[PDB]
């Protein structure tokens, strides 16, 4: 009954990113966020050079007609010092410095190269094939703007202007429970109508996978006044807090009516499959989010919805949310119009080289292995119905969380 | 003259995956290596359940074709072990243990509730709506190959089977460092012709987005003595060793007879763009793997060749020479034949939503146009020349190292 979309923008307008900021050296800045613009202290690249390996002229002693001689070499590592005579070129390699008063480089391949001199006939035009100071980057230019996550690509960049450390925003602190006398921990006998928690574990590994840091508090005893403590527990040390399982999603019951005292939270039927229902709204200081019970839906949830969240939470400009691509299927498809149907692909090139799909098999919420056997997600436009092979169809690979 | 491919067979060829095991809470596991087969030591599900919200029923109460009476619920936490009389049903929901006596489970899709009892509208055999109990998951059956790399999609159903923890391959460790008196770190000035070393940051940011322990020897002095006491302590704490560059990847100089002396070390000419040069070879206790001074190639080097040798040697039994679709250019590119060339470019939905890729633009060999202005690999067939727009071509997306996936 609501649009995975129009849930998502809701969550994303009432949620502020965070702004308390830590400086860091940059090889513990891995997947973090800039906390302010980086600006460049250099110019880059930081003097004339030569963009090929050729030889270093000016417009004059072309224009003169002669061979020129060649009255020195300047190279990567060591710039040519001394005479530069009229009526003489300089050797130069790429990267080289362009030496002093020159007015362009011409690369070698347009070149004679014989006994007294380099014999020129192509027109030069000034300034050709020099790269000038700061063209890739001057200096007081911004670099990475702040909300810029920080990757292999851009802390070298860093490092390269002589950069020791960054401020970056503060990591995003999410506390973590589950609650039900059904649900056991690994060790115990499984008990009479029990089962082994592991929402819980799912939702720890993906949220520290995505930078976060956790606050586990385990599963909480079936009880009010346990439920309750944990609640104020939770929202006291931390941004978000989430049930990974066990405290209600509308369904009425001690666990519903809590929430309802300490927060005004929605309880969400969203339009999709697999999975439906999940809470969301204001604790005191953090944001609350409520999971379904069901595994598979649990983890779609958290993925589809939570992650974003966290994302625009942490500071980070982008979607935190991989892209998708149209594909075709090697796969007939069962999807009934309504929900928006996330199923499990195996996206991999076909004979010909082409990128196809394919169905893991069973696609029910009662196994949960269609997430190893799985490489991406398929996700079906709510209204759309059942798909023949060879169809159009939009694709979402997993990102690291799931390999 | 040596091709890409070739130097990475080599490579794997010689080497022997650890087998050194630790044993962890599922919770530490993520990215680490099974070592042995994960055995499921139960059945899931564990006692024989229901599909749906129904009623568990009968075949000599059916056999009647008469309304009947609800005696009892089971429900998921609660199951049902109550009287259920003779001519009667128990209300079960989607998930339940199917009470004693029980032959199958009907939908109210094919029910209605009468004054005098449940009536049935539908057909009821033997075996409808029971889960079998481990007919998911049999116990005793292999679950997850050793080898396999642990992530969110094993790690909860390894957690389903009620195990807390599981032995995993210790991380490979790896020791860096690089030298010269070229090299200077943040904070100081610039001897005349110095820079800044930014190939070991690189190195060891990914090594660690990897799962390994890096042990960072900094920069090492250009004195033969620093140079050899660094090899040798490097070697004897580490499973490889790394020069992320001032190292000889073969020119003759005092780091090259150290080479030689400590390991028996080949210098490789790859047939590659950007880059050529590189060392590998064994040592003592270790393997050495030596880059290109050069940043675009020492990156491209660690990436292409070192990223899969660590693969191996973990224990990941995944073969994984990451995804490469093929996709049309926005940009001509200039191409040599004879070399292989990674250039780096920029791949894009257009407006039909299928992909195509346009260059970084091209100015100079540059961390900058190279990574972070890409956001992947334009990997070009060595005998290929130039590419005018829309001609197909192999894209290979940057991974999570540079924020790929």
Redesign the interface.
């Given at each position: 009954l609501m649009s995975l979309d129009t849930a998502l923008n809701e969550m994303l307008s009432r949620v502020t990113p965070l702004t308390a900021q830590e400086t860091l050296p940059?090889?513990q800045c891995?997947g973090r966020i800039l906390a302010s613009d980086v600006v460049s202290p250099l110019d880059?690249?930081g003097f004339d050079?030569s963009?090929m390996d050729g030889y270093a002229v000016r417009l004059a002693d072309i224009a003169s007609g002669q061979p020129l001689p060649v009255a020195g070499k300047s190279f990567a590592?060591?710039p040519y010092h001394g005479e530069w005579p009229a009526g003489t070129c300089i050797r130069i390699m790429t990267?080289a410095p362009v030496p002093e008063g020159c007015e362009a480089v011409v690369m070698q391949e347009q070149t004679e190269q014989m006994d007294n001199g380099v014999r020129f006939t192509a027109e030069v035009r000034s300034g050709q094939n020099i790269?000038r100071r700061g063209?890739?980057?001057s200096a007081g230019a911004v670099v990475?703007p702040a909300g810029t996550?920080l990757?292999?690509?851009?802390?070298?960049?860093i490092?390269?202007?002589?950069?020791?450390?960054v401020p970056v925003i503060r990591k995003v602190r999410v506390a973590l429970f589950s609650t039900?006398?059904?649900l056991?921990?690994?060790?115990?006998p499984?008990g009479?109508?029990?089962i082994?928690?592991?929402?819980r574990?799912?939702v720890?590994?993906?949220l520290?996978?995505l930078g976060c840091e956790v606050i586990?508090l385990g599963i909480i005893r079936d009880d009010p006044h346990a439920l309750r403590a944990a609640f104020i527990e939770a929202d006291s040390q931390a941004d978000v807090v989430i049930s990974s399982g066990g405290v209600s999603v509308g369904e009425a019951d001690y666990t519903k009516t809590i929430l309802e005292e300490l927060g005004e939270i929605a309880f969400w039927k969203l339009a999709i499959k697999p999975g439906k229902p999940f809470a969301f709204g204001k604790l005191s200081n953090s944001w609350f989010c409520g999971l379904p019970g069901n595994?598979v839906s649990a983890?779609l949830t958290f993925y589809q919805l939570v992650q974003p969240l966290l994302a625009k939470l942490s500071g980070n400009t982008a979607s935190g949310l991989?892209?998708r691509?149209?594909v075709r299927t090697a796969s007939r498809l069962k999807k009934t119009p309504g929900r928006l149907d996330f199923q499990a692909g195996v996206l991999q090139?076909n004979a010909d080289?082409?990128?196809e799909v394919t169905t893991t098999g069973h696609q029910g919420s009662?196994?949960?292995?269609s997430?190893?056997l799985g490489n991406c997600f398929i996700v079906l436009e709510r209204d759309r119905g059942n798909v023949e092979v060879g169809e159009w169809v939009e694709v979402e690979?997993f990102?690291?969380?799931?390999?």
């Amino acid at each position: 009954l609501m649009s995975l979309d129009t849930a998502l923008n809701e969550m994303l307008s009432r949620v502020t990113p965070l702004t308390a900021q830590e400086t860091l050296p940059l090889v513990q800045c891995f997947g973090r966020i800039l906390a302010s613009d980086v600006v460049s202290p250099l110019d880059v690249p930081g003097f004339d050079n030569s963009a090929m390996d050729g030889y270093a002229v000016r417009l004059a002693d072309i224009a003169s007609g002669q061979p020129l001689p060649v009255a020195g070499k300047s190279f990567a590592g060591q710039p040519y010092h001394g005479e530069w005579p009229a009526g003489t070129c300089i050797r130069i390699m790429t990267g080289a410095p362009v030496p002093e008063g020159c007015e362009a480089v011409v690369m070698q391949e347009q070149t004679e190269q014989m006994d007294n001199g380099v014999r020129f006939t192509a027109e030069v035009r000034s300034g050709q094939n020099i790269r000038r100071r700061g063209e890739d980057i001057s200096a007081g230019a911004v670099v990475f703007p702040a909300g810029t996550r920080l990757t292999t690509a851009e802390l070298p960049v860093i490092a390269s202007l002589g950069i020791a450390e960054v401020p970056v925003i503060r990591k995003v602190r999410v506390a973590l429970f589950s609650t039900g006398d059904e649900l056991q921990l690994p060790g115990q006998p499984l008990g009479d109508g029990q089962i082994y928690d592991t929402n819980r574990l799912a939702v720890h590994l993906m949220l520290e996978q995505l930078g976060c840091e956790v606050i586990n508090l385990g599963i909480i005893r079936d009880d009010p006044h346990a439920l309750r403590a944990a609640f104020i527990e939770a929202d006291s040390q931390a941004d978000v807090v989430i049930s990974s399982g066990g405290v209600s999603v509308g369904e009425a019951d001690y666990t519903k009516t809590i929430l309802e005292e300490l927060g005004e939270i929605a309880f969400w039927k969203l339009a999709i499959k697999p999975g439906k229902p999940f809470a969301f709204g204001k604790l005191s200081n953090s944001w609350f989010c409520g999971l379904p019970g069901n595994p598979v839906s649990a983890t779609l949830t958290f993925y589809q919805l939570v992650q974003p969240l966290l994302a625009k939470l942490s500071g980070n400009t982008a979607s935190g949310l991989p892209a998708r691509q149209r594909v075709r299927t090697a796969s007939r498809l069962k999807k009934t119009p309504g929900r928006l149907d996330f199923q499990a692909g195996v996206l991999q090139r076909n004979a010909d080289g082409e990128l196809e799909v394919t169905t893991t098999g069973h696609q029910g919420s009662h196994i949960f292995s269609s997430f190893s056997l799985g490489n991406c997600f398929i996700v079906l436009e709510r209204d759309r119905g059942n798909v023949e092979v060879g169809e159009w169809v939009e694709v979402e690979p997993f990102n690291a969380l799931f390999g």
